[PDB]
């Protein structure tokens, strides 16, 4: 039931970003 | 000859330690030299 | 000293010949009790700096049960034994199609050459013996009891009577001088008939492991 | 040849000490002194059956020597290869084997026990030797000693 | 008196010195604070330490960079208190007739000589120690070197911690290309130098650059050639070091805390040899000649022992062992609290000095350290301060055995064998010949600790 | 020594097959004392057929 | 590298990536793209996928046990 | 006893920490979760030396919390059973001496203490002292004891020691 | 089911290498230094403080050189890793004390050779005073 792939967090891509507040 | 006996030797017999205190060896001669005294000296020198 | 070498080599030959007899090979009667005086006469010259060498000291014997099970006793004839010489000996033994051979190595052995005895094929059986070790017969010593190798048939019967396992029997190291003298390997049981003070005779069986 | 950095003066001092320390003109290393004396005790004396039949103990010289060189001492001229035994079980193990140690261990254990006149049954002594040599190699007695 | 000057800085300079010590007879301080006399018997009944107040005169000189020096006098500052042994000079029962002792509920036949701490009578068991400022040569077969030139040197009563130097002589067992040639050479290990430096280099650091001067101090009889040959190999190692500065540089190379700059190595070596090494012979900067002569004697003593012309010193010889009684023992302890007392004053004033305001001495001096410091070990038996991260010497200040009068007398005269390396190497249990007339041979506790504990001879 | 010896032989016992074995069941001796007799009932004597 | 899966992004992967990202955005997660007043979290993540800024990395487990790390930006989405 | 180990800990990271350099947040988070705690299997984790590596962050379905398996190097204090180690006395009571072996506290029962020792309630401060008074155990006294057994309670390890064995005491 | 005297313990600790009490203080100091100044974080846990005092109070060595020398000296022998830290931490006065405290040593160490090792540790450990 939609388990053949898992989502993994990557930090190198998160190195850019600003919090909305 | 001083041969360690008693507790010191009893410990060393159960304690298999490679180097005992006085690890003496007894050498028994055979033949004609075993009876003569002078003929046993050369063996003494060749062992010492 | 040339004179010293005659006694040193004579003892090795005398002990080596008795080694085959104890193992169970057919050995001529004269060669067991061969005298030192006959050692020089049957060679005709002094070993050191003479025609008699260690190469010709090689002896050939056949097993009493079957003659096809011959045995070899080679002598390296060198201060140290290397791999190249070892490969030659087994290669030489290949022509005769023999399964067991004995090497009388000198006091020094190459550590690399020692590996040759480990990597050999299962049908190869090479046993190393230091020159000093063979100068005396360990079996004849009073402390050493009489050792008899037990055949496979006896071992199975022995365990059935006593209902014993291989691990239960007393163990003996394969590298023991007596074990090396008889050339026994793992899984062999040695019958020890020692003169017990209490019962007079006491038969003990030890498994090589 | 070497004549033609300690060329010859300092080298002579160096070589001089070496030949006075680790040079063996005749003998076997690890042997400091040898004690030779006729044994008055019967056990040391050789017992040989006489023609008549009665036991007789002849006088044979015995050389008790400090240190263990059984491997080389045994392989010596005019030395008995049978009755020559050492008191060191470790040396006997590497020369004669574990089986010979069982008898040697018994003799040493009995020798010390009988030195003061006390006696112990052979069965008890044999049991201790068998357990130590049961595995084929000398085993130190269990050192925990909880019980 | 021998206390180092107290210096505080952070312009405002404060120099505090102790002028004199005043000791009064024992008194009891209750909630009222009156200095009522404290009888020894009262201490046992009330389970309090029998002790007397300690007072010290403190003089402080303060300079605020104003070219005006003024000082104030503090008369009989309450530094703390000192336990008083019974029947001592400061004890309340000294020189009293037998009649007076009964009035105070004290036994006239009781000899005293103990301390009452928390109501428990404690006797300071004498601890034998190796004699100081004495040269001893011993032979050990386990060390890599044949002979030991052990000589622990200390000044009078104690100005600095005892420092020991072992002028050893390498054994001939080792073999080498150059070692065999020279053979046996003398190596001396300095107290603050981890590695063993040749003794010859030490003399060069002192100032005796010439090699002949080295032989003059060591070899007194030049006619005898046997001793001369033994010192020859030692010169080979130190030959390359000819200048005194190089010798000072050489020693400082292996120092505990080598200096980053080259000049610092010479200074560290200069201080170590001048102060750390051989403190007893000389502590100033103009005792190089005196220090060298003692150093040469140690080598000379080693030469006699090595050649066999001088018998090796006996480990069990009581002449080589000194006995530490309540006096010598408490003297060492008193330094522990006093040294910490200065630190407490310094630390307390440190926060005050940096703020610029003067610090009152009444708060600076800590009475608890002096009082509790001595009372602690004397009660517990663990010698020394507990805070310091070490192992205290137990078995000292045991409770007096009052089962029998004879037992009480024996306990007071009781002796203890040395512990540690000194006691272990020797055979304190075995009875030596030196005990004749000095230590009772028959008297010794039975058990594992047999012979370690003994009793002083009657006379 | 007494404590050490007991521990190394505490499990040694004579089984019902007249054999000496330890807890692991390893045969220490085929027969107790090599004869299979108790050490208390044995009595000292000298047979006169060898002297 | 040596990735054998299709370069395109499956519909199931797109739905989960946006859903997980949208849940993250609703949990005070930062937004790589500029915010122009889009309140609904799904819209914020939807434009993030368009701009190829979603940090999520898709680990596709092959039936043989091997896994391939495919980035959302690397994958070719359909708009 | 102090050892050097390489442990594995699954770090739960909130989506709020998905900003620039979240590995720094993961790295700093590991200095609070496994630091200062006491796992019952490996003992007290007194300190962390360095971080070996940080694994890929797997997003847990439904929960939405990313799981980061991180490997780190740390030093633990695991008291092995039947091990003799020095201890520091913190308090003394009629029940027995209360010792402190580093981060943990070990309790010594009266029975385990040698019979020669006798508790003295008045003596200020209390200290187990024998009649001969050769040896006394005060507070903050360095003594050697053998841990007969250890038990894990409320995520903490409690040890029981004894001094019946030879050469256990002030020395 | 585990006992330190018999050298029986969980297999995981076999790979771990033991550390000295004084040596651990250095590691704790390194951890303390960075936390105090390198990063602005919460104060160190009470457990960290408690073990820091224990290591400092029982620290038998002054600097790393003394620690390294003892570690190197004992590494040359066949000393087990468990005994490596235990012997140094205990600092037995004599060989007899070490064997009774450490049953494992007496199995493969003689009364003479081990004594030559403990005395070496004594020469390395130093007193504040």
Residue numbers in the entry:
A (entry chain A): 1467 to 1487
B (entry chain M): 1115 to 1162
C (entry chain Q): 2 to 210
D (entry chain M): 1264 to 1267, 1278 to 1420
E (entry chain N): 60 to 69, 81 to 529
F (entry chain M): 860 to 910
G (entry chain F): 49 to 127
H (entry chain G): 1 to 171
Give the article text.
The dimer is formed through a handshake-like interaction between the stalk of one Pol II copy and the active centre cleft of the other copy. In our dataset, we could also classify two more distinct states of the Pol II dimer that display a rotation of one Pol II copy with respect to another, leading to slightly different locations of the C2 axis. There was no cryo-EM density for the clamp domains in any of our reconstructions and no significant protein degradation was observed for either RPB1 or RPB2 by SDS-PAGE, indicating that the clamp is mobile. The structure of the Pol II dimer is incompatible with transcription activity.
